[PDB]
Design a protein around this ligand. Structure first.
Ligand code: CL
Ligand code: CL
Ligand code: CL
Ligand code: CL
Ligand code: CL
Ligand code: CL
Ligand code: CL
Ligand code: K
Ligand code: K
Ligand code: K
Lengths: 230, 196, 219, 199, 244, 243, 238, 248, 204
């Protein structure tokens, strides 16, 4: 028999800073690098999927996940916490569709998912999520890219990077990224930003990449990743 | 079976209610008041089930008074009527519903004189004139006949006179006395009770 | 409402009419009684229209969620069980009689499920007000391993039978064909009745209608 | 519906008919009313179709877990108790009689009747609407220690007669035989069906 | 062996070296209690417990450490007796629930499995403390044969041919290893149980003791019950005279 | 600044200044407190489990001492770590497996069972009231569509599919052994996969053990039923190595 | 100490200090003696006064017609357990129409007293009881503690200086079984007398006696009803 | 259990609440947010803290929220807590509308949320919302209004006020310039740009760095608009041109 | 009948880049009429309207509770609602009371914001959506309204002619219903403007 704690594990310090959120921000900042780019006619999301051993089955688990027909997810930080947010976001997407009979606007999903992240910064007996989410989507004939973080705050991006070397990844994108890209060009600059922080040689198994357009969201097959790696 | 009536003018609302408190076949009271003071310019007249009327009417009365204390100003005749409608409609699909037929009369400083009709089903409708009870079937035609939206207070009491005389002649129930009150710019004024 | 399911060699075919009746009067002459559940699983709904719609959409939503977590093509056997248990919980108060058909790793499957929660698996079935007519045709002209084209024709015939014979059945016949390669939904596959033609023109010269009040808000 | 279960030395025989009917109309002339609770345990379905199928599923679920916890094939008695318990907990809410028959190592082939939420073990049991017309038949046609094949004849015969008498019973006869070796499932088509006095 | 201040106050807190000390301290409570014993014979299981007499004012038979969990199941406890009785009640209800659901006597392995889950549940949270005792479960039937199980504060359960818990669990186990229990009748076993208790008992540290003995085998028709005064006193005389 | 601590981050499952979870990290060290090593290898036609069977005394019933557990007819598992924690996870796994079939009508896939336990293990990682389970579950079984499967779940909540995996005290040395055997592409038969698993545990521990000193559980394409090999069948594979 | 603030915290030695601290509450209360023959069960307790102006505290309490108790420790915890004992005895008579066997009632105390010792935020019962009862098995003397553990005893004494009474009963424990009721109470009084200091002895104001057995239902004598037992006294020797 | 309890809803020896006053410090590090009341309207002016070359600009605003048909608010503090409160503000405004069938009076909506925030400081053992809010609106009782909300759950009606970074410097700057009873919306817009320019960090001031919304009564309808970039550009440059005419 | 208690008639029609919606103005209890100016058509935004026929309380309740959910939608979303989305919102609202339903059958009529496209639909008392390219009717004179609409409606009608058709369809169908009348209110919806008209209907 058990009964949970009813007191907040995230409190205000004398400085006025919620320490556990910034500590959760350290968990994502130390995780594997991820990059997202909004490119006029579509969105691309890419991440480092280096399992650091040849024993692993690279096909079993995925980091780039679909939420619905038109929305995808990538993360930096902890895998287990990310899974919870995926399952919650998939349910929120269906809850919206059952009520309105319309594919959920990306901005509306991120708002609903970020609100779940907010709970774990105030609710009793729980720690915040150690994950920053990268949400892509297509609705009203327009590409969307969003960032959700442990705080529960959300930001809209043209292009951004998170995880290891997120500071060097962003400055790279400031110079490299230009508006009005083609989707196929966006995959290149996504892998290029990922190469800046890699360490090792890139194979189609070492990285994972998903794309979102007017035809919906899908993860690129290992054969498709190999062709861009040249 | 009881009787309510309201007549709205250009700058006033005239309301009247019978003074009979009846049980089975006996008249227990000759001077029972069926009017409830909600605000300085709001009156609620209630009719229906014996115990349900007073309990419901006072509950709304005390909540309109609660609003006055919490804010420093009173509810508008419209906001008051919509509040009473909300409370009755929420009890409609419950285990214990209130079988009350009511008539809300008020004066707003902006909109002016107001008169609201409401079912026991809780359907709200604004009317230039309305009547509750079985006596309405005998009086609504007289109201339809002589009513003009520019009726003076002198003529309004005389029109009420014509309606109450009809209840003495044709209506099978004995309703000899009526409470008569007028709401306007200055508030609620107690007017001479019409006896037969 | 006449709905039918047929199992053939390459897959399954489902049929429905398009008539929705309120009271004993026709409200919709063109409604969709074949419901999306999974890309390769569809369900035919008869009973209370709202119930069939919502129960179906619920299943479809759950099935998508299942597919997402599983990462695999959903099973029709899974859909049937989901439906049963939900419907059983409500003791037949959710008026949904359904024909669910789909293709699996396990092949083509046809199920019928009743509002009380009973299910049965079979090569062919018909549900709804016009089921008698449709079952009659299938019982008469059904052979196992029918070619798709023969199956298409028989199903149409079966549902057509319901349209003409039943008063609560009418409109066009919709068919949905499910094969391992694909699922082709054919709306208005066949239309037995077309009356567009009217002999009189009931038009009114502007001003015929007497207006007391006019108000126009520009935007 | 006509359902029958007969007990022999090696194991048991469970019989059923193929029809479900809604009033005077038949909605399924080919329905298998023989559901397995476990590898060696079967039950025969009667009553409300929805209720019967609902109980069958739960019984199979609980027994599946029961088996794993014991790491042994469930006793038939155990199987019979779960069905009895579900039927009894909701006697007013659920309308079903399930006959549970199977094989276990401890006590061999066994037959249980759970009608009404009671537990009884019998040499053989009949259930359903059709059972009324064969009460006389079974009493005169029963002999102790019938061989598997004799048992099959017995259940087939009884159900055939019930099917012809009963309006709510028809279709083909479904038969299973449970032994230590395995489960034998066979169907008897109308042409194969036994013949008696018809007129 | 122990960590102070922080990592040993709660059972919901792991120590740096991957240990739950609240469970280990609960394991110390049974180590302090007097020795409980039980072994599996050819045709049943016999239990034996040394019961330290705190005061001669207490009745002969008080503080029973041998319990009847079910008509065929017996429990031998060692540790905080308060927890031992609550676990005896939990085990009784579990055996009762099995018969109510499945209609026959609960298999001992499953009973041991079920109660061990309840014990384990008290090792995960800060809201509750682990049980401060260890206990044994024994049964016999014609189908399952003789069986003997033991559960400790962590929630671990294993089968045994011979088992001991308490003060001198090591001094008892080495004496059990000498016996050919796989071939011995349970009538002969009682004699050997009684003598190992007497050898294990410390007469110069602990004041005095009583011997508790239990049956569960073919001679008792599969029912768990107490060893009669006649057979016990024969085994007690056997224990005193072979102590030389 | 690696390994910094502030507050109760060492006692409850909350974040450190670095963004770590020490309580989760200590739970991995609780797996080594069992004092045993488990190895799993996947072939083309099979999936094999092996773990050392230590019996301290003959007073213990040897048949009851096991870390090999059956969750489904098709799915088995090996447990490494705290014995009581391990048995709790097995009971929950059997519950989830049977609960899946009741809701969805088909046999639970090996990957889906592993994810489900990983999600429940995540709850202990986020809520502070309870500790994580100091155990490790390696699942085997054959998917009807994707062939043989070997999966592993963490107290952290991490789950993944593997070609070969080790767990426990001698985990790090046995994973490096398996890497060397993977690079060389052998013909992964039943005998090859069993012996690769056996020789792995026999080299890292260096024993050359008796049939009674180890446990083996297998899943094969022709026979998807999870089976424990017992003494006689393991003895056949042990004398096959010495040939 | 830090292992002594909660019942859910085990000491490194393998102990719970909060149970042991609750056991200290029993020793601080005034002494009470319980003993039995083959036919009767007698409780003798020492009433205590905080001041001479205030009256003496109640020590003996009613439970049922066949069962009675004597308290030692906290008053509210004593009354809480007393009400539970009364309720269990009432439930037994309501359902079975026969008096609840003493053995089973004490087992219900053992089950109830155990619950709060294992839950966080809860505390042990700060009272120890001596239960005297009569049923089918004859007279019974039972002992309960803050720790849920209970004892079946021939004679017992708990409270302040109860060791002196405990030693007296231990010498005369073979005497009790053939004792006459009047002789049995005097043995209980002589044990309670040993607890008091040399200056003071048993008076009519500070002695409470409770008797249950084959002859009569449980009865409490306090003031004027006590003097027949005190009269006929062998003088206080040393 | 109580070992890990931070005791959030507890009193300090001096008679104050720590978590409330610690939350006040979070507001000070957030964006500068000011509100000014005029005769023919009321406006909000706030510093954008989300500024980058790579930000997309999807929403109409960053810190300004529409709550009602006749009401709008601006935010300073933790944005996630702000999103929770603003969503609740939209709910309470709609619950009043559903019941009375007329828009909620400005003061009443502020009162309702402040009771929720106060509840978080007294019971529950939870951290308070680290957000300060500025409400602007129009009701039929008091006309154009401006309100300030504290994490303590305490409120007040202002003619001009500011919360966030350099808040004490901004209010004393307003105290000197604000002309009570003579303030028009055009004068208040000019004052907003003046205060922001001196208060803000990056010095020069930009159309991407500030956010201004106006609330006016037009044709019997309450009109709320978030000012376009081309409008803001003119507001900054009009102050820039007067900065050049200040020397001779 | 429960629907027959208060009565009422609501109708919607479709035309060339425009939609029309009309209702009777009667509020009455069984035997008598109380109000001549009762509202049944409610605006759910500029260029989108809902008409509600049935029990007067539920007509008012649904309208108020839908506005509650509409305003929250229009605040959470940064847009004005699409006609299909409103239909699904009413469908969800009504179905939530599956076994205790509001006794009203709603009619959505409006033009799609941004995309100009006309949209008309009607729903059950338990929220079953019906989308047509011609007309939808709801009320106590369903049969009377169906008989008029089937004979009068044409594929491509200009705002001038659509008003005349939808009026005549409402006028004559109401004159055959004893529980509907006391005036008819018509809304003609265009991109440029919205035209509101009360007609010289029978007052008997
Ligand atoms: Cl708490
Ligand atoms: Cl039609
Ligand atoms: Cl029979
Ligand atoms: Cl039956
Ligand atoms: Cl691991
Ligand atoms: Cl005391
Ligand atoms: Cl509003
Ligand atoms: K469903
Ligand atoms: K036996
Ligand atoms: K200590």
């Amino acid at each position: 028999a058990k009964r949970g704690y009813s007191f907040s594990l995230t409190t205000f310090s004398p400085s006025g800073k919620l320490v556990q959120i910034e500590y959760a921000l350290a968990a994502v900042a130390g995780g594997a690098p991820s990059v997202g780019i909004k490119a006029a006619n579509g969105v691309v999301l890419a991440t480092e999927k280096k399992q650091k051993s040849i024993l692993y089955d690279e096909r079993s688990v995925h980091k780039v996940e679909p939420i619905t027909k038109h929305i995808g997810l990538v993360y930096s930080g902890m895998g287990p916490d990310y899974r919870v947010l995926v399952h919650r976001a998939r349910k929120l997407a269906q809850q919206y569709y059952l009520v309105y009979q319309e594919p959920i606007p990306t901005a509306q999903l991120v708002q609903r998912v970020a609100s779940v992240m907010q709970e774990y910064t105030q609710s009793g007996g729980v720690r915040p999520f150690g994950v920053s989410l990268l949400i892509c989507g297509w609705n009203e004939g327009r590409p969307y890219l969003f960032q959700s973080d442990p705080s529960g705050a959300y930001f809209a991006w043209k292009a951004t990077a998170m995880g290891k070397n997120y500071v060097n990844g962003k400055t790279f994108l400031e110079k490299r990224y230009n508006e009005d890209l083609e989707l196929e060009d966006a995959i290149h600059t996504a892998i290029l930003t990922l190469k800046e922080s890699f360490e090792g040689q890139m194979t189609e198994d070492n990285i994972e990449v998903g794309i979102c357009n007017e035809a919906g969201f899908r993860r690129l097959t290992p054969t498709e990743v190999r062709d861009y790696l040249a | 079976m009881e009787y309510l009536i309201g007549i709205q003018g250009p700058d006033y609302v005239l309301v009247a209610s019978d003074r009979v408190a009846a049980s089975n076949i006996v008249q227990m009271k000759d001077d029972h008041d069926k009017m409830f003071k909600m605000s300085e310019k709001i009156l609620l007249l209630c009719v229906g089930e014996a115990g349900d009327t007073v309990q419901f009417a006072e509950y709304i009365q005390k909540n309109v008074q609660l609003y006055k204390m919490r804010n420093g100003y009173e509810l508008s005749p419209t906001a008051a009527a919509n509040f009473t409608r909300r409370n009755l409609a929420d009890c409609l699909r419950s285990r214990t519903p209130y079988h009350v037929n009511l008539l809300l009369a008020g004066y707003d400083e902006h909109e002016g004189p107001a008169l609201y009709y409401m079912d026991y089903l809780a359907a709200l409708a604004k009317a230039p004139f309305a009547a509750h009870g079985y006596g309405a079937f005998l009086t609504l035609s007289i109201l339809d006949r002589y009513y003009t939206p520019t009726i003076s207070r002198e003529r309004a009491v005389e029109l009420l006179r014509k309606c109450l005389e009809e209840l003495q002649k044709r209506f099978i129930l004995n309703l000899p006395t009526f409470s008569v009150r007028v709401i306007d710019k200055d508030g609620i004024h107690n007017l001479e009770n019409i006896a037969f | 409402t006449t709905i039918a399911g047929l199992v053939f060699r390459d897959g399954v075919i489902l049929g429905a009419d398009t008539r929705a009746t309120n009271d004993s009067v026709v409200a919709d002459k063109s409604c969709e009684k074949i419901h999306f559940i999974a890309p390769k699983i569809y369900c035919c709904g008869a009973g209370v229209a709202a119930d069939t719609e919502m129960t179906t959409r619920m299943a479809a939503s759950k099935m998508e969620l299942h597919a997402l977590s599983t990462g695999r093509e959903p099973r029709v056997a899974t859909v049937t069980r989901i439906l049963r248990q939900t419907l059983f919980r409500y003791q037949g108060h959710v008026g949904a009689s359904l024909v669910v058909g789909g293709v699996d790793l396990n092949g083509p499957q046809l199920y019928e499920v009743h509002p009380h929660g009973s299910y049965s698996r079979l090569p062919f079935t018909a549900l709804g007000s016009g089921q008698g007519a449709a079952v009659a045709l299938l019982e008469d002209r059904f052979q196992p391993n029918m070619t798709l084209e023969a199956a298409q024709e028989l199903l149409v015939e079966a549902i057509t039978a319901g349209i003409l014979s039943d008063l609560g059945s009418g409109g066009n016949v919709d068919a949905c064909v499910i094969t391992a390669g694909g699922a082709k939904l054919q709306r208005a596959l066949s239309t037995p009745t077309e009356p567009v033609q009217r002999a009189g023109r009931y038009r009114f010269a502007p001003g015929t209608t007497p207006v007391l009040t006019r108000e126009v808000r520009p935007l | 519906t006509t359902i029958m279960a007969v007990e022999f030395d090696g194991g048991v025989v469970v019989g059923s008919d193929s029809r479900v009917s809604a009033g005077t109309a038949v909605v399924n002339r080919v329905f298998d009313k023989l559901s397995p609770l476990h590898q060696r345990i079967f039950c025969a379905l009667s009553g409300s179709a929805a209720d019967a199928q609902a109980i069958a599923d739960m019984a199979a679920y609980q027994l599946e877990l029961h088996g794993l916890e014991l790491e042994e094939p469930p006793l038939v008695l155990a199987a019979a108790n779960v069905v009895k318990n579900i039927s009894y907990k909701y006697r007013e809410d659920l309308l079903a009689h399930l006959i549970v028959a199977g094989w276990d190592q401890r006590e061999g082939g066994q037959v249980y009747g759970t009608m009404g939420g009671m537990l009884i073990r019998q040499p053989f049991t009949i259930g359903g609407s059709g059972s009324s017309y064969i009460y006389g038949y079974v009493d005169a046609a029963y002999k102790p220690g019938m061989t598997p094949e004799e048992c099959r004849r017995f259940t087939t015969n009884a159900i055939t007669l019930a099917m012809n008498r009963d309006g709510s019973s028809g279709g083909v006869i479904y038969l299973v035989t449970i032994t230590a070796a395995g489960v034998d499932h066979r169907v008897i088509l109308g042409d194969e069906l036994p013949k008696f006095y018809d007129e | 062996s122990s960590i102070g201040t922080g990592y040993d106050l709660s059972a919901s807190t792991f120590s740096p070296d991957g240990r739950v000390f609240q469970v280990e301290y609960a394991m110390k409570a049974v180590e302090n209690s007097s020795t409980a014993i039980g072994i599996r014979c050819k045709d049943g299981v016999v239990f034996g417990v040394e019961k330290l007499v705190l005061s001669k004012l207490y009745e002969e038979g008080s503080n029973k450490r041998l319990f009847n969990v079910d008509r065929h199941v017996g429990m031998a406890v060692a540790g905080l007796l308060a927890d031992a009785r609550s676990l005896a009640d939990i085990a009784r209800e579990e055996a009762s629930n099995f018969r109510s659901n499945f209609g026959y006597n609960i298999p001992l392995k499953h009973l041991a499995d079920r109660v061990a889950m309840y014990v384990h549940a008290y090792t995960l949270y800060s809201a509750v403390r682990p049980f401060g005792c260890s206990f044994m479960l024994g049964s016999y039937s014609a189908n399952d044969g003789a069986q003997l199980y033991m559960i400790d504060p962590s929630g671990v359960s294993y089968g045994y041919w011979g088992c001991a818990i308490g003060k001198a669990r090591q001094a008892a186990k080495t004496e059990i290893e000498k016996l050919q229990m796989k071939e011995m009748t349970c009538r002969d076993v009682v004699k050997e149980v009684a003598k190992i208790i007497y050898i294990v008992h410390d007469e110069v540290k602990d004041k005095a003791f009583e011997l508790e003995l239990s049956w569960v085998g073919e001679l008792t028709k599969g029912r768990h019950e107490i060893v009669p005064k006649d057979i016990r006193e024969e085994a007690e005389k056997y224990a005193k005279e072979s102590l030389k | 600044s690696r390994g910094s601590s502030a507050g109760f981050d060492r006692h409850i499952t909350i974040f450190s200044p670095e963004g770590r979870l020490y309580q989760v990290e200590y739970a991995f060290k609780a797996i080594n407190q069992g004092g045993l090593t488990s190895v799993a290898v996947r072939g083309k036609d099979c999936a094999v489990i092996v773990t050392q069977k230590k019996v301290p005394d003959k007073l213990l019933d040897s048949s009851t001492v096991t870390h090999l557990f059956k969750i489904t007819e098709s799915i088995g598992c090996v447990m490494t770590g705290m014995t009581a924690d391990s048995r709790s996870q097995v009971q929950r796994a059997r519950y989830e497996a049977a609960n899946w079939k009741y809701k969805y009508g088909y046999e639970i896939p090996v990957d889906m069972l592993c994810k489900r336990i990983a999600d429940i293990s995540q709850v202990y990682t986020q809520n502070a009231e309870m500790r994580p389970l100091g155990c490790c579950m390696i699942l085997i079984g054959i998917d009807e569509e994707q062939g043989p499967q070997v999966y592993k779940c963490d107290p952290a909540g991490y789950y993944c599919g593997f070609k070969a995996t080790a767990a426990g005290v001698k985990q790090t040395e046995s994973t490096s052994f398996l890497e060397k055997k993977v690079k060389k592409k052998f013909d992964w038969t039943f005998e090859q996969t069993v012996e690769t698993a056996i020789t792995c545990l026999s080299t890292v521990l260096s024993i050359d053990f008796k049939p009674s000193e180890i446990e083996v559980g297998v899943v094969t394409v022709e026979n998807p039923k999870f089976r424990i090999l017992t003494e006689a069948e393991i003895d056949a594979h042990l004398v096959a190595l010495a040939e | 100490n830090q292992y002594d603030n909660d019942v859910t915290v085990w000491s490194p030695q393998g102990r719970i200090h909060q149970i042991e601290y609750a056991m200290e509450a029993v020793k601080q209360g005034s002494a009470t003696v319980g003993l039995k023959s083959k036919t009767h069960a007698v409780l003798v307790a020492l009433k205590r006064a905080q001041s001479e102006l205030a009256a003496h505290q109640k020590k003996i309490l009613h439970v049922d017609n066949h069962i009675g108790i004597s308290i030692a420790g906290l008053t509210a915890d004593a009354r809480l357990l007393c009400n539970f004992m009364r309720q269990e005895c009432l439930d037994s008579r309501f359902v079975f129409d026969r008096p609840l066997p003493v053995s089973r009632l004490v087992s219900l105390i053992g089950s109830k007293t155990q619950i709060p010792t294992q839950r966080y935020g809860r505390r042990p019962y700060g009272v120890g009881l001596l239960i005297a009862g009569y049923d089918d098995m004859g007279p019974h003397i039972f002992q309960t503690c803050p720790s849920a553990n209970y004892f079946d005893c021939r004679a017992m004494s708990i409270g302040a200086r109860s060791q002196s009474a405990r030693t007296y009963l231990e010498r005369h424990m073979s005497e009790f079984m053939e004792c006459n009721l009047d002789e049995l109470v005097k043995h209980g009084l002589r044990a309670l007398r040993e607890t008091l200091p040399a200056e003071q002895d048993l008076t009519t104001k500070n002695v409470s006696i409770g008797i249950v057995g084959k002859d009569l239902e449980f009865t409490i004598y306090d003031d004027d009803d006590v003097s027949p037992f005190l009269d006929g006294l062998e003088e206080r020797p040393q | 259990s109580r070992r890990y309890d931070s005791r959030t809803t507890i009193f300090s020896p001096e008679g104050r609440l720590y978590q409330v006053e610690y939350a006040m410090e979070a507001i000070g590090h957030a964006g500068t947010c000011l509100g000014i009341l005029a005769n023919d309207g009321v406006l909000l002016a706030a510093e954008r803290r989300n500024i980058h070359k790579l930000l997309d600009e999807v929403f109409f605003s960053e810190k300004i929220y529409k709550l009602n048909e006749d009401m709008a608010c601006s935010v300073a503090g933790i944005t996630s807590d702000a999103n929770v409160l603003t969503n609740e503000l939209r709910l309470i405004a709609q619950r009043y509308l559903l019941q009375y069938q007329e828009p909620i009076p400005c003061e009443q909506l502020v009162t309702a949320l402040c009771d929720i925030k106060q509840a978080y400081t007294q019971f529950g053992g939870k951290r308070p919302f680290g957000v300060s809010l500025l409400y602007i609106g129009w009701d039929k009782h008091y006309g154009f209004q401006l309100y300030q909300s504290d994490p303590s759950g305490n409120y007040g009606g202002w003619k001009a006020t500011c919360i966030g970074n350099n808040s004490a410097a901004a209010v004393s700057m307003l105290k000197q310039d604000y002309k009570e009873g003579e303030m028009t919306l055009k004068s208040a817009l000019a004052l907003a740009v003046k205060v922001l320019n001196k208060t803000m960090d990056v010095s020069k001031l930009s159309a991407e760095k500030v956010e201004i919304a106006t609330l006016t009564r037009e044709s019997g309808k309450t009109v709320i608009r978030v000012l376009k970039q081309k409008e803001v550009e003119q507001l900054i440059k009009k102050h820039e041109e007067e900065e050049a005419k200040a020397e001779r | 009948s429960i629907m027959s208690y208060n009565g009422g008639a609501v109708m919607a029609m479709k035309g060339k880049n425009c939609v029309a919606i009309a209702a009777d103005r009667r509020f009455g209890i069984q035997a008598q009429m109380v109000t001549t100016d009762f509202q049944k058509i409610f605006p759910m935004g500029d260029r989108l309207y809902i008409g509600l026929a049935g029990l007067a309380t539920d007509v008012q309740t649904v309208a108020q509770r839908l506005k509650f959910r509409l305003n929250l939608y229009e605040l959470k979303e940064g847009r004005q609602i699409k006609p299909y989305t409103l239909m699904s919102m009413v469908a969800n609202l009504l179905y939530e009371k599956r076994f205790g339903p509001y006794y009203t059958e709603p009619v959505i009529a409006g033009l799609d914001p941004k995309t100009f496209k006309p949209f008309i639909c009607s729903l059950d008392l338990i929220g079953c959506p019906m989308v047509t390219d011609d007309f939808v009717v709801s009320g106590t004179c369903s049969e009377q309204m169906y008989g008029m609409c089937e004979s009068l409606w044409e594929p491509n009608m200009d705002p001038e002619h659509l008003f005349e058709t939808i009026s005549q369809a409402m006028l004559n169908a109401v004159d055959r219903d004893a529980v509907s009348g006391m005036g008819v209110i018509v809304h003609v919806i265009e991109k440029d403007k919205i035209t509101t008209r009360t007609l010289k209907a029978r007052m008997d």
